[PDB]
Design an enzyme around this catalytic site. Structure first.
Site, short mmCIF file in Angstrom:
data_model
loop_
_atom_site.label_atom_id
_atom_site.label_comp_id
_atom_site.label_asym_id
_atom_site.label_seq_id
_atom_site.Cartn_x
_atom_site.Cartn_y
_atom_site.Cartn_z
N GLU A 227 -2.66 -9.52 3.16
CA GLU A 227 -2.95 -10.12 4.49
C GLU A 227 -4.43 -9.95 4.86
OE1 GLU A 227 -2.05 -7.08 4.12
OE2 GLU A 227 -3.10 -5.94 5.67
N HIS B 22 -3.85 -5.18 -0.01
CA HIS B 22 -3.48 -5.84 1.27
C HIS B 22 -3.49 -7.35 1.07
CE1 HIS B 22 -3.57 -2.44 4.27
NE2 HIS B 22 -3.83 -1.86 3.10
N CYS C 91 0.83 -1.19 0.00
CA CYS C 91 0.00 0.00 0.00
C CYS C 91 0.88 1.25 0.00
CB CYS C 91 -1.07 -0.02 1.09
SG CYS C 91 -2.63 0.58 0.50
#
Ligand SMILES: N[C@@H](Cc1c[nH]c2ccccc12)C(=O)O
Ligand SMILES: N[C@@H](Cc1c[nH]c2ccccc12)C(=O)O
Ligand SMILES: [Mg+2]
Lengths: 660, 651
Positions: free
Chosen positions: B161, B159, B75
């Site tokens: 994750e 993202h 990001c």
């Protein structure tokens, strides 16, 4: 700290495959030691789990690890055979393995494929070992010791031809954490817990009115909605017991005020979460096997929003109510709504007899006298009418529309991804706590309802939201609610709105960002690989509203207390937004005042180390002839100002209706 | 050696502990978490191998610019730092899924296109400077992935994750792999200088052997006699006539390294061979030349004898009559590119001097251009160590060991010796015509000639520290008709016995690679694939890994040698059974034949379907898997089948 795993190498050509799988499953590589190494030399105290690798031939230091160590052990093949002894031929070939789904086999489908590397199996099994799994061939594939934390598998989980190898290793890691969390308790308990089952289930409201004083400090944890899997138990008690205490906290001062059965208020200038962690460690009492719940007495009450000052937030606003308020329940009444019986819990000091055995006898007679026939059992735009005729919000519509606009700016400047902007409503009422609560629980039956009657305030909660459910074994569950839809009234418009809530990407996104936030909070205190999300975007319907609910689970690290876990996750992500620290700073500026009890946590910390906490939403705080209740919702980039305001009015309806 | 130390810079966002989890599970090691307001002076950045820069709403700048370490920006950075634009995306998207399409490169290796990713940004990268390169794009035409074309910087504008993302663990493992490659590359004060000339002509490989190399003298011919896309592409030929060329042999008996310079003198050294080879490859490191589409950077070409097991996990139970290792240090090599139809000439000078390397390139370039215009049972007098009756009882004995759980699979082999009035080049000419294979080899050394028709890859190791092994186990003969072949390749893939024989070797080689490879890097991309060659159908499985930082190429070969496909499981105990029952050495057979590059790369075959010529006699090994399901007569006949190629070439 993270968990430590010893991998004993028996000089077979599979030890390094097990090394990989343990590494991937637990997020830490095991320390590898040879079988012929010196046991007395090995620092076994430092290790928290043994994996006994496969060897050639028939069943050195892997013997000592099983018999003496007293540590969790996983036997793989020859280690499995090792456990079987101390207490057809298939090499590189697959069998379907059927199992009971317990311990090392939990989460695994039955059957599942596994490869075997043996010509010998456990035929006659000792009485203190039970089989957990069998091959389609009909030989024992899994076993366990009925007391000691010892497990065997007669297959290679790490073999390329095997499925769910990493899961089996994650399951053993989970079993070892729970074993070391259960070893902390010894003969160190300063209390004796007396239990008594009564074969009657009187109406919970009759128990409150009939058994508890009426005037004085009382708690009622109220499963007003009972549904298999969601809610089952109600808990009630008072401060009249000899060992009972009432605890309050002010952030401004930073002092813990404690009132015993002396009458004395003790002032300690410290933080509440550390105070609670310390008391919970000192007052540790093991769970009873006779009880189908893990609340074996302890602390019942609420953690206020402003406690954020001790977590990741700033002391920006002063609450007019205690920032923490808990009754230490030395005696309580537990209703089992599923099985239709009661449990009476009373604390005696381990040496003394403080009439705990007498309280079980007296209150058991009272309860059988209350056992009589169980009695018989809104939509928009009227749901979005107002906050009531005498009510006054901190921010009127216009003021709230501007706070939403400020939220949309902060998200456009990339300071926040989701802001849970909330309002506080104050309405004068002459209503007493119990009558008002009796109206509320009837209006909005809910799994996490509560009536707290404390000296400073009464808390009337119709919350459906699970914040943290923590087992004594260290299992963590959080069910964040985010994404709300009003009821229809017309059952056509209702099931239409229910389907809209499950499908809209806006509401899914509101929920998902909170799932990621709560995952983050849990990961900070949970074992690597333990944090998962078994259910995403489930719809739950209650009398007032339709709610989007996601389920997050984890397992605490060794050395992490139940109090440490709540601190790490407080305040709840579902009531702040992401990222939490910067979002709580935005909330401080826009709300221009405290939340108080609202958007905090309400529930119990058990002496077993278990906990069950709700999020304080749909709650009335009664103090000094005033009812105050919080309402709010998620602001995201896609939010419409009018709709977001209307949503805060809708969420007030149950409280507005109870008041009149 | 050691595990990779990942640093995770926390930029005060509620994503760091989720990244922590995914790095932990993917790499098998939790990252060190450092606040973004840390002091870069006090920070021991030297101890860390990779930096993950968390998203935010500091030292992140110094991480990307100064540190010069592998960085994965997630990001929030790399785009803006190198004079790129941070512009508003078509639609702001927070906790919103999108389908990401990509090139499958670097952090996107092995991910399907599209895959689902969650986005937490209102800002994206519109323009990208020359230095940056996009790797991934969203379903609304926004860059989701980038890299720097030189510096080891990777950017991901989603993202990985996030709960709503897929293949997040795979992305962090891919980044770990890239970080290992960067650190293995930066290590490779060089003693030699590498000169390379491309010649856009492809002559006949056999006419390069006849024309460019001498009939007598120390020579090598690594012969892709069979050339298939992504299987075999290159052939390597050379001699010891160069100024810097060395012939290197070893004996396990003495433990003595004999190296013979081009001057003529032979210098002897007492050192375990793998420790000598490691030491020499470390001293003689020359960087990869990206002009070359192959990894062979010049270096050592030859074989590791089975009896070198005495210095790995084995016992010195039998002395080989041949050298236990034999490598020509090739300072000059001809490389044939069978795909693009051109020749590459590699020649080595010493950094200080100029030893006519530039001259040798120009001369042999004219020679190759000239050639391209010209040319673009066991046997009648053969004698097995064990006759049928003897070999059947050695299988009976193998079955006893398996029933007593000493071994799960024994690779029992026989050694066949036959007199021959045939020379190396003519016999290999027949052998390569009879059995075209990807790993064919003619090594003409003083002590012996090695005529390999091996199709089997033992270890292919890149300079980036990427390891591949393709163990062969499970064999069937060819059939008369095309319809008979389809039955036999169908039968080989289906039988439980053959699948078991192969799987146990896959578990064995996985175990070998895991001892030297990064946690999570070892996987089996292909299992029980059937390959067809002239003599037999072979059941083949592919195993991959990446080397730990501080693990040499030689250390990886030592850990995996001898090959599991030629021993069985467990390797140590099974090699003791082999010692007992075979009553003598394997020698070159069941060893490893190939090259060790100055770049740190290696490509090694298993020595099977190989004739050794020495003292005017031909000798070749044959064997097979013995398992609980083994029938003795069938297992013996299997060894006679696997001899056909060597027997027909000798006859
Ligand atoms: N529903 C919980 C008990 C409960 C009711 N209300 C609560 C409020 C807070 C904490 C727990 C509770 C159970 O079934 O066990
Ligand atoms: N087939 C290899 C080169 C090669 C041929 N025969 C060999 C024998 C040993 C080692 C390598 C080789 C390639 O294309 O790159
Ligand atoms: Mg599998």
């Amino acid at each position: 700290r993270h968990m430590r795993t010893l991998l004993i190498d028996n000089y077979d050509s599979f030890t390094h495959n097990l090394f990989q799988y343990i590494g991937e499953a637990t997020g830490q590589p095991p320390v590898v030691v040879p079988n012929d190494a010196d046991w007395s030399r090995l620092p076994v105290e430092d290790f928290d789990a043994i994996v006994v690798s496969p060897g050639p031939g028939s069943p050195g230091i892997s013997r000592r690890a099983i018999t003496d160590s007293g540590l969790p052990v996983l036997g793989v093949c020859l280690g499995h055979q090792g456990i079987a002894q101390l207490f057809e031929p298939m090499h590189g070939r697959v069998s379907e393995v059927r199992h009971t789904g317990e311990d090392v086999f939990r989460g695994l489908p039955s059957p599942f494929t596994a490869v075997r590397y043996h010509s010998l199996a456990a035929t006659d099994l000792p009485d203190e070992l039970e089989p957990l799994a069998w091959s389609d061939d009909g030989v024992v594939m899994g076993l366990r010791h009925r007391e000691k934390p010892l497990w065997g598998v007669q297959f290679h989980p790490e073999s390329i031809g095997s499925d769910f190898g990493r899961e089996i290793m994650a399951n053993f890691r989970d079993l070892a954490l729970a074993h070391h969390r259960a070893r902390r308790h010894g003969a160190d308990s300063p209390y004796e817990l007396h239990v008594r089952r009564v074969d009657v289930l009187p109406d919970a409201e009759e128990v409150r009115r009939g058994c508890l004083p009426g005037e004085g400090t009382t708690f009622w944890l109220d499963s007003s909605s009972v549904l298999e899997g969601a809610s089952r138990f109600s808990f009630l008690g008072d401060d009249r017991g000899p060992l009972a205490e009432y605890l309050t906290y002010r952030v401004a001062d930073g002092v813990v005020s404690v009132r015993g059965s002396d009458g004395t208020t003790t002032r300690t200038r410290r933080p509440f979460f550390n105070y609670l962690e310390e008391q919970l460690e000192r007052r540790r009492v093991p769970v009873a096997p006779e009880l189908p719940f893990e609340f074996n007495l302890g602390y019942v009450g609420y953690l206020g929003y402003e406690l954020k000052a001790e977590t990741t937030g700033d002391p920006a606003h002063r609450s007019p109510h205690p920032d923490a308020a808990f009754l230490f329940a030395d005696r309580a009444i537990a209703l089992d709504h599923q099985e239709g019986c009661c449990y009476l819990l009373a604390l005696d000091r381990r040496g003394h007899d403080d009439g705990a055995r007498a309280w079980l006898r007296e209150t058991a007679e009272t309860l059988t006298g209350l056992a009589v026939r169980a009695p018989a059992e809104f939509g928009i735009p009227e749901a979005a009418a107002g906050f009531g005729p005498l009510a006054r919000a901190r921010h009127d519509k216009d003021a709230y529309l501007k706070r939403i606009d400020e939220c949309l700016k902060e998200i456009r400047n990339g300071e926040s991804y989701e802001i849970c902007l909330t309002n506080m409503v104050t309405a004068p009422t002459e209503a007493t706590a119990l009558p008002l609560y009796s109206a509320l629980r009837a209006i909005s039956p809910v799994p996490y309802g509560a009536l707290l009657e404390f000296p400073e305030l009464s808390v009337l909660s119709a919350s459906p939201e699970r914040f943290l459910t923590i087992g004594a074994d260290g299992g963590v569950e959080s069910k964040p609610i985010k994404g709300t839809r009003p009821r229809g009234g017309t059952a056509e418009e209702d099931e239409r709105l229910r389907a809209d809530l499950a499908g809209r990407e806006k509401d899914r996104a509101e929920n998902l960002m909170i799932v990621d936030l709560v995952r983050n909070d849990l990961n900070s205190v949970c074992a690597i690989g333990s944090v998962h999300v078994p259910r995403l975007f489930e719809v739950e319907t209650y009398a007032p509203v339709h709610q989007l609910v996601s389920t997050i689970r984890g397992r605490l690290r060794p050395g992490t207390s139940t109090a440490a876990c709540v601190r790490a996750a407080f305040p709840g992500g579902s009531m702040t937004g992401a990222p939490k620290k910067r979002t709580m700073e935005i909330i401080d500026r826009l709300e221009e005042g405290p939340r108080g009890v609202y958007s905090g946590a309400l529930g119990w910390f058990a002496l077993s180390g278990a906990a069950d906490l709700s999020i304080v939403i749909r709650t009335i705080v009664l103090a000094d002839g005033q009812a105050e209740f919080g309402v709010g919702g998620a602001i995201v980039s896609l939010s419409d100002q009018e709709e977001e305001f209307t949503e805060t009015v809708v969420k007030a309806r149950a409280m507005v209706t109870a008041l009149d």
